[PDB]
Ligand binder design. Structure first.
Ligand SMILES: [Hg+2]
Length: 186
């Protein structure tokens, strides 16, 4: 039964190389965030969570040098959170099968009640995190037809179909996109 302090300690003990100030707050924030999730007893890991973490990390770590340490940092962060970085990476990778598929097909699979894995992750209940929203956003970007042009319209199509809390998703992705647009234009 670990603590935020214990987690920060495990991360810094595993990765004793310098981390630049530009990147260090994002990493600390993500350490705390995942910690708080993973000790909620209703949180249940799934590939949607994996895709979210990989996506958010990859986005804020763009440009990081020395680039070789990006993987050491990912490893240290996973082990600090009592996760297996190989499992998170496999799970993220498992979504690649849907590249180029149309939204109609995905909705058909979800409405059948027997969606393939990891798409079935969208049904599974448990404590919701903004990282689930990030994961969902990464998955939708893979589909044919630029479905995130009108992201909220796409999310309204999913609302009757999946128990993921779509109003929370819509707001989390508005904040995610706002934050990234600011960071990118500074
Ligand atoms: Hg990780």
């Amino acid at each position: 039964p670990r603590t935020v302090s214990d987690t920060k300690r495990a991360f810094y003990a595993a990765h004793t190389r310098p981390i630049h100030s530009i990147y260090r707050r994002f990493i600390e924030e993500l350490l705390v965030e995942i910690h708080l999730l993973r000790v909620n007893v209703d949180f249940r890991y799934s590939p949607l969570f994996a895709l979210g973490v990989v996506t958010a990390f990859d986005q804020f770590m763009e440009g990081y040098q020395p680039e070789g340490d990006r993987d050491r940092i990912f490893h240290a962060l996973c082990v600090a959170e009592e996760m297996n970085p190989q499992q998170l990476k496999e799970d993220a990778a498992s979504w690649q099968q849907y590249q180029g598929r149309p939204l109609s097909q995905i909705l058909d699979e979800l409405n059948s009640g027997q969606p393939s894995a990891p798409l079935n992750s969208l049904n599974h209940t448990g404590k919701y995190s903004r990282l689930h929203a990030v994961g969902l956003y990464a998955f939708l970007q893979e589909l044919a037809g630029e479905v995130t042009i009108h992201l909220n319209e796409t999310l309204d199509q999913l609302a009757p179909v999946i128990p993921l809390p779509i109003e929370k998703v819509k707001r989390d992705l508005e904040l995610y996109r706002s934050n990234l647009d600011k960071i990118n234009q500074a």
